[PDB]
Amino acid sequence: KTHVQLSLPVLQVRDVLVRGFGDSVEEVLSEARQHLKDGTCGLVEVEKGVLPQLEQPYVFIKRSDAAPHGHVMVELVAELEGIQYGRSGETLGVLVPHVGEIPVAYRKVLLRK
């Protein structure tokens, strides 16, 4: 399918053990896509002081439509030294590996894969 229905565990930034997906824009988008497919992807909600606690390049999920079965349609945008790779809507959060952290909530998304 072109789109996949996911529920992303929302993690507190101070709990996150692995604070990014890798060392290049291409690697982090690749890894984020793989983790999203394998159900091993978490979401950190972006507020004051959150991004400096995480590792660049960042992967954002961004609203791509203005929500089938409650799933907001999203796409991936990467960011390194203030340049973004992709163009989309409002940030829902930044993606990180999920390695067993206890979530605070779930975010239902429909991912353009």
mmCIF file of C-alpha atoms in Angstrom:
data_model
loop_
_atom_site.group_PDB
_atom_site.id
_atom_site.type_symbol
_atom_site.label_atom_id
_atom_site.label_comp_id
_atom_site.label_asym_id
_atom_site.label_seq_id
_atom_site.Cartn_x
_atom_site.Cartn_y
_atom_site.Cartn_z
ATOM 1 C CA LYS A 1 0.000 0.000 0.000
ATOM 2 C CA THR A 2 1.052 3.646 -0.631
ATOM 3 C CA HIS A 3 -0.134 4.573 2.926
ATOM 4 C CA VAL A 4 0.213 2.606 6.223
ATOM 5 C CA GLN A 5 -1.892 3.183 9.398
ATOM 6 C CA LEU A 6 0.440 3.515 12.447
ATOM 7 C CA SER A 7 0.035 4.378 16.164
ATOM 8 C CA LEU A 8 3.324 6.038 17.307
ATOM 9 C CA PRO A 9 4.232 5.875 21.021
ATOM 10 C CA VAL A 10 4.830 9.411 22.328
ATOM 11 C CA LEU A 11 8.025 9.497 24.448
ATOM 12 C CA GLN A 12 9.236 12.160 26.918
ATOM 13 C CA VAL A 13 12.572 13.549 25.551
ATOM 14 C CA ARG A 14 14.446 12.835 28.865
ATOM 15 C CA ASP A 15 13.480 9.084 28.631
ATOM 16 C CA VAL A 16 14.777 8.620 25.045
ATOM 17 C CA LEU A 17 17.806 6.272 24.988
ATOM 18 C CA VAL A 18 18.731 6.585 21.240
ATOM 19 C CA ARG A 19 18.301 10.261 20.295
ATOM 20 C CA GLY A 20 18.455 9.980 16.468
ATOM 21 C CA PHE A 21 18.562 7.608 13.474
ATOM 22 C CA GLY A 22 22.108 8.279 12.127
ATOM 23 C CA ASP A 23 24.671 10.635 10.663
ATOM 24 C CA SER A 24 23.292 11.853 7.254
ATOM 25 C CA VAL A 25 19.960 13.155 5.904
ATOM 26 C CA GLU A 26 19.723 10.037 3.653
ATOM 27 C CA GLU A 27 20.550 7.612 6.553
ATOM 28 C CA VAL A 28 18.068 9.140 9.060
ATOM 29 C CA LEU A 29 15.163 9.128 6.514
ATOM 30 C CA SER A 30 16.084 5.518 5.570
ATOM 31 C CA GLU A 31 16.247 4.377 9.231
ATOM 32 C CA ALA A 32 13.069 6.320 10.208
ATOM 33 C CA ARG A 33 11.173 4.575 7.334
ATOM 34 C CA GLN A 34 12.511 1.121 8.403
ATOM 35 C CA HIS A 35 11.589 1.683 12.146
ATOM 36 C CA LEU A 36 8.113 2.995 11.110
ATOM 37 C CA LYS A 37 7.636 -0.256 9.069
ATOM 38 C CA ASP A 38 8.963 -2.503 11.983
ATOM 39 C CA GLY A 39 6.887 -0.700 14.703
ATOM 40 C CA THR A 40 10.135 0.391 16.487
ATOM 41 C CA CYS A 41 9.614 4.183 15.970
ATOM 42 C CA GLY A 42 8.692 6.703 18.694
ATOM 43 C CA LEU A 43 7.509 10.320 18.478
ATOM 44 C CA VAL A 44 8.763 13.236 20.605
ATOM 45 C CA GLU A 45 6.474 16.309 20.612
ATOM 46 C CA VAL A 46 8.499 19.447 19.766
ATOM 47 C CA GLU A 47 8.476 22.245 22.394
ATOM 48 C CA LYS A 48 11.004 24.815 23.730
ATOM 49 C CA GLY A 49 14.242 22.995 24.660
ATOM 50 C CA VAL A 50 13.399 19.576 23.072
ATOM 51 C CA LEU A 51 15.368 19.671 19.745
ATOM 52 C CA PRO A 52 18.762 20.609 21.356
ATOM 53 C CA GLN A 53 18.388 17.385 23.486
ATOM 54 C CA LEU A 54 18.158 15.248 20.289
ATOM 55 C CA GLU A 55 20.787 14.386 17.618
ATOM 56 C CA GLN A 56 20.829 15.962 14.096
ATOM 57 C CA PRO A 57 19.903 15.181 11.436
ATOM 58 C CA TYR A 58 16.273 15.306 12.742
ATOM 59 C CA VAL A 59 13.328 13.467 11.106
ATOM 60 C CA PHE A 60 9.948 15.268 11.500
ATOM 61 C CA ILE A 61 6.502 13.902 10.749
ATOM 62 C CA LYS A 62 4.460 16.737 9.251
ATOM 63 C CA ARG A 63 0.684 16.908 8.524
ATOM 64 C CA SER A 64 0.257 16.224 4.736
ATOM 65 C CA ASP A 65 -3.627 16.592 4.550
ATOM 66 C CA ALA A 66 -6.370 18.756 6.299
ATOM 67 C CA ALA A 67 -7.778 11.828 8.748
ATOM 68 C CA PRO A 68 -8.924 8.261 7.886
ATOM 69 C CA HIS A 69 -10.173 6.228 10.922
ATOM 70 C CA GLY A 70 -8.522 8.939 13.190
ATOM 71 C CA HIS A 71 -5.066 8.623 11.460
ATOM 72 C CA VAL A 72 -3.684 12.103 10.459
ATOM 73 C CA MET A 73 -1.934 11.861 7.054
ATOM 74 C CA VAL A 74 1.778 12.732 7.510
ATOM 75 C CA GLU A 75 5.023 12.708 5.568
ATOM 76 C CA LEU A 76 8.706 12.724 6.632
ATOM 77 C CA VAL A 77 10.898 15.852 6.411
ATOM 78 C CA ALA A 78 14.604 15.729 7.517
ATOM 79 C CA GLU A 79 16.622 18.683 8.902
ATOM 80 C CA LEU A 80 20.420 19.282 9.183
ATOM 81 C CA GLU A 81 22.076 22.633 10.188
ATOM 82 C CA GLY A 82 18.729 24.438 9.518
ATOM 83 C CA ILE A 83 18.156 23.040 5.966
ATOM 84 C CA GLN A 84 15.097 20.727 5.425
ATOM 85 C CA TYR A 85 14.795 17.893 2.858
ATOM 86 C CA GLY A 86 11.141 17.768 1.911
ATOM 87 C CA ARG A 87 8.252 20.205 2.094
ATOM 88 C CA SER A 88 5.072 19.534 4.155
ATOM 89 C CA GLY A 89 2.632 20.956 6.786
ATOM 90 C CA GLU A 90 2.759 21.438 10.598
ATOM 91 C CA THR A 91 5.179 19.290 12.699
ATOM 92 C CA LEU A 92 3.448 16.549 14.788
ATOM 93 C CA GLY A 93 6.853 15.685 16.360
ATOM 94 C CA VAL A 94 10.383 14.350 15.785
ATOM 95 C CA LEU A 95 10.881 10.600 15.250
ATOM 96 C CA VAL A 96 13.385 8.536 17.311
ATOM 97 C CA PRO A 97 14.122 4.828 17.737
ATOM 98 C CA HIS A 98 11.789 3.167 20.290
ATOM 99 C CA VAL A 99 13.779 0.697 22.421
ATOM 100 C CA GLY A 100 11.183 -0.017 25.229
ATOM 101 C CA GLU A 101 10.680 3.464 26.769
ATOM 102 C CA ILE A 102 7.191 3.779 28.402
ATOM 103 C CA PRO A 103 5.041 6.155 26.311
ATOM 104 C CA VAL A 104 2.780 8.946 27.667
ATOM 105 C CA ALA A 105 0.309 8.659 24.735
ATOM 106 C CA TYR A 106 -0.161 7.397 21.133
ATOM 107 C CA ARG A 107 -0.341 9.468 17.919
ATOM 108 C CA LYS A 108 -2.401 7.834 15.105
ATOM 109 C CA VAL A 109 -0.861 8.730 11.706
ATOM 110 C CA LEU A 110 -1.382 7.569 8.106
ATOM 111 C CA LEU A 111 2.148 7.475 6.596
ATOM 112 C CA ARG A 112 2.755 8.057 2.846
ATOM 113 C CA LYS A 113 5.311 5.183 2.326
#
